[PDB]
Amino acid sequence: DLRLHLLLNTSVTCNDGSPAGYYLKESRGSRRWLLFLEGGWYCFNRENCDSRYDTMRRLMSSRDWPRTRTGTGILSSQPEENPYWWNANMVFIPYCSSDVWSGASSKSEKNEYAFMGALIIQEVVRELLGRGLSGAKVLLLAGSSAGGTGVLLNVDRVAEQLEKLGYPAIQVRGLADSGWFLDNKQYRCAPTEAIRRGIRYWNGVVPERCRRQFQEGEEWNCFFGYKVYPTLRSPVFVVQWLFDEAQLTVDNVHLPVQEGLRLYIQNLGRELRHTLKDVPASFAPACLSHEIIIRSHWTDVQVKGTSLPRALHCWDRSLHPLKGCPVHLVDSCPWPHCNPSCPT
Ligand SMILES: O=C(/C=C/c1ccc(O)c(O)c1)O[C@@H](Cc1ccc(O)c(O)c1)C(=O)O
Ligand SMILES: O=C(/C=C/c1ccc(O)c(O)c1)O[C@H](Cc1ccc(O)c(O)c1)C(=O)O
Ligand SMILES: O=C(/C=C/c1ccc(O)c(O)c1)O[C@H](Cc1ccc(O)c(O)c1)C(=O)O
Ligand SMILES: *[C@@H]1O[C@H](CO)[C@@H](O)[C@H](O)[C@H]1NC(C)=O
């Protein structure tokens, strides 16, 4: 089990002003640290956030959090469930800021809610340094869904923070699962505009080089993986289903497929594959599904005969091509479940 610690700096808060926090299981024989960012959509104005507070309150408040959680998938300490990093120090950071991990704005007489996701990550890192992170060799910042996009928005800031604090031996890397989306045309509500409005409501922040390319008022571009990834300096491994259910939902696709929809789905897969061509560390199976890394059976899927735990191990070796140890694994078959190992 991982144990809850509420942040000692109680001014770094969830949406409703309650303290943010993290769950930790230490492994004193290991110099590897895995920090995982939870996902769960976002909210972008007062009325939309009020609705989320009624029926998704654990994503906005720590008032009802449990004292422990079980680590699963890449967060499991059992070698059989986690061939990759079972002996690592494990951290789960709950998502309670509703801002895709981008916000830097406190609750005030002008703000009903606080949006502090970017500050929560930096405060977790600072407080872990006294619990053993100061001795680390690798810090892997991982996340799924909105947490996967959060990795892309925050990995370089973590690297910069540790350098400025005086810890140049810690190698910071990212793993972004199910957070690589396209700002495409819908098959038949305005998903890209919701991000633009959210950034203004949250005081959202994006990585510096990407901000400088797109300039004032265009920071929404940096929430899309294919636009922000080329600007990043830290190594980042990308995991993305070619036919992600969240992408299909925002595209208004709900699955006897006729020709128009067949062509739409085939084109989506081809576009996603194109965006990954210059991503050297990636795992992209031709399946209709969502999320991958914290489920217990994450070991089952394979691309070209290689599982995700193997690909991540090969990535570790490459950061010290390798014979029989590939790191770029993107399916080329053009329809969901053309890969026989897709989740059932
Ligand atoms: O038919 C299958 C089914 C594979 C499969 C089906 C479900 C799984 O969960 C899984 O891990 C693998 O095998 C593949 C070939 C194959 C499978 C595993 C390998 O390690 C390999 O190198 C090739 C085929 O299409 O011929
Ligand atoms: O990944 C997203 C959001 C994706 C998104 C993608 C493109 C956009 O322009 C945009 O505004 C949002 O939400 C997921 C949740 C989810 C969405 C749809 C599903 O079918 C699902 O099973 C889970 C999360 O953070 O848990
Ligand atoms: O290419 C193959 C199989 C090749 C193959 C070649 C020789 C074998 O002995 C064998 O078992 C399998 O299957 C793929 C489907 C596929 C199977 C397993 C995968 O991990 C995958 O990513 C795609 C296809 O037809 O596009
Ligand atoms: C607590 O966090 C706030 C906001 O991030 C910061 O301004 C403040 O200096 C922090 N307090 C301490 C003691 O570090």
Curated annotation (Swiss-Prot):
Changing residue 145 to A: Abolishes enzyme activity. Unable to mediate serine depalmitoleoylation of WNT proteins. Glycans are attached at residue 9. Induction: Up-regulated in hepatocellular carcinoma (HCC) with high intracellular beta-catenin. One of its GO terms (cellular component) is endoplasmic reticulum lumen. Its main location: secreted. Its EC number is 3.1.1.98. GO terms for biological process: bone development; negative regulation of canonical Wnt signaling pathway; negative regulation of Wnt signaling pathway; protein depalmitoleylation; regulation of bone mineralization; Wnt signaling pathway. It comes from the Eukaryota. Keywords: Glycoprotein, Hydrolase, Phosphoprotein, Secreted, Serine esterase, Signal, Wnt signaling pathway. Transmembrane segments: none annotated. One of its GO terms (molecular function) is palmitoleyl hydrolase activity. The keyword Hydrolase applies. Belongs to the pectinacetylesterase family. Notum subfamily. This is Palmitoleoyl-protein carboxylesterase NOTUM. It comes from Homo sapiens (Human). The chain holds residues 88 to 451 of 496 of the full protein.
